[PDB]
């Protein structure tokens, strides 16, 4: 059947396509499913290393931190007004049993948790 050919399917719906990309799988699906068989090393007849295993490269990286003035600046600050607002809000909360915590806000809780 000419209509069932892989060439004809692409017309209905070059170097970009990868091996195994078909009607059922896209390129990302192909690579994610190849993850389960990925982690193997390749060796030749002489025993050399054609390709190292995944996440097992033996090369020593050059670990340096460049000089920069972004390291010495303040990253997080809070105003006195914001501190007062959050201190007042901590205490007025009426927790409902049917409300769940999806994401907790990042706050200076050491500065906010002051109790007489």
């Amino acid at each position: 059947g000419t209509g069932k050919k892989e060439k004809s399917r692409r017309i209905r719906e070059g170097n970009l396509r990868v091996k195994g990309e078909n009607f059922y799988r896209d390129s990302k699906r192909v690579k994610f499913l190849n993850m389960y068989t990925s982690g193997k090393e390749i060796r030749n007849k002489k025993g050399n290393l054609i390709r190292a295993a995944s996440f097992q490269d033996s090369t020593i990286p050059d670990a340096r931190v460049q000089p920069d003035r972004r390291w010495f600046g303040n990253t997080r600050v809070i105003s006195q007004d914001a501190l007062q607002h959050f201190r007042s809000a901590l205490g007025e909360t009426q927790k409902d049993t049917y409300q769940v915590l999806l994401r907790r806000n990042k706050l200076p809780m050491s500065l906010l948790e002051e109790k007489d």
């Binding site: 993850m35 389960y36 068989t37 982690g39 295993a53 996440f55 097992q56």
Partner: protein, 65 residues
């Protein structure tokens, strides 16, 4: 050195899982991936939340999150 190969299967024939041998910081709201889709492993014993930070000025060390 960073990663350790973790073998799966009854005959230990698959070797696609990797375990980080160094200490890590995972952050807030961390949940473990499902085991079938968990390639990178950061064991809970090696997760860190606080550090001993020395201030150059005033010469003190404080345990900070």
């Amino acid at each position: 050195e960073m990663f350790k190969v973790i073998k799966t299967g009854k005959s230990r024939s698959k070797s696609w899982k990797r375990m980080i041998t160094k200490h890590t910081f995972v952050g807030e709201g961390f949940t473990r991936r499902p085991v079938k889709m968990e390639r990178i492993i950061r064991p809970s014993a090696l997760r860190q939340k606080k550090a001993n930070v020395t201030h150059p000025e005033l010469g003190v060390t404080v345990f900070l999150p």
